[PDB]
């Protein structure tokens, strides 16, 4: 996260760290949506152009974390993956359209002050909150800049949703309805963006109707980090909720 700040303890209890077993390293962010299901970006698990195709046994999920590199004894919980489900129409060949994946844990994780699931939006909450200008929150242990370097603890930044035409005119990549972009415009002064290592993490919004946090997006892609005139792109969670429901219902 660039231009963000240290998260408070228990501020994002649904935050999940996708951890590579060997070598032990941070791969991506993710989110807890139930005691046995974790949501992340498909590109975090599958991306043929870079010879990336992880299997269940190559990864681990660390939940309830704050510190990036330390083993948080008596606080974080480490879970093994039972099965990975990537959207069947995830477009890794072109623009990362439908960049979403689900991971089922081998065993249910125990909720605590530091571990708690986030809500997935309904059509009405999505329609009401997904508006240009409305701000969401992005969290992660990704790099602090495109080029300090890495954060000691979880970072957080609030960013405004951007108008679709502006999103489209900011890049040469083909934008689809399954994506939305966020970030400040050059003339807005304020800055902030996700960066390397934050992918797969959540873009959440707190509903002013019921005071619950909803995950509206998944950190998907960007060209550089916090560059003027550029914006981060996020997977539109509600647009792909039918797929999420289908997977969970069947498995």
């Amino acid at each position: 996260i660039v231009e963000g700040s240290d998260a408070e303890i228990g501020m994002s209890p649904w935050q999940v760290m996708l951890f590579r077993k060997s070598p032990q390293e941070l791969l991506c962010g993710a989110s807890l949506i139930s005691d046995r299901w974790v949501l992340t970006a498909a590109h975090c698990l599958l991306y043929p152009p870079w010879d990336k195709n992880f299997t269940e046994n190559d990864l681990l999920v660390r939940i309830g974390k704050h510190s990036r590199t330390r083993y948080e004894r008596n606080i974080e919980k480490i879970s093994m993956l039972e099965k990975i489900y990537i959207h069947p129409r995830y477009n890794w060949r072109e623009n990362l359209d439908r960049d979403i994946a689900l991971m089922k844990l081998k065993k249910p994780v125990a909720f605590s002050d530091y571990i708690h699931p986030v809500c997935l939006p309904d059509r009405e909450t999505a329609a009401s909150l997904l508006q240009a200008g409305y701000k969401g929150r992005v969290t992660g242990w990704g790099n602090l800049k495109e080029t300090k370097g890495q954060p000691s603890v979880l970072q957080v930044v609030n960013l405004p949703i951007v108008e679709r035409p502006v999103c489209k005119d900011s890049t040469r990549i083909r934008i689809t309805d399954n994506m939305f972009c966020a970030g400040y415009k050059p003339d807005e002064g304020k800055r902030g963006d996700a960066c390397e290592g934050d992918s797969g993490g959540p873009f959440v919004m707190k509903s002013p109707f019921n005071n619950r946090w909803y995950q509206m997006g998944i950190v998907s892609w960007g060209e550089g980090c916090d560059r003027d005139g550029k914006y981060g792109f996020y997977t539109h969670v509600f647009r792909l909720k039918k797929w999420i429901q289908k997977v969970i219902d069947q498995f």
Binding site: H116, S207, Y214
Partner: peptide, 27 residues
């Protein structure tokens, strides 16, 4: 169910340092 309600915040009626910024943007 109880999703989206944080034990250390909403559950105890405590607000985090920047959630107000989000609320103020929901005009």
């Amino acid at each position: 169910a109880d999703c989206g309600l944080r034990p250390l915040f909403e559950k105890k009626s405590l607000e985090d340092k920047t959630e107000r910024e989000l609320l103020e943007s929901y005009i």
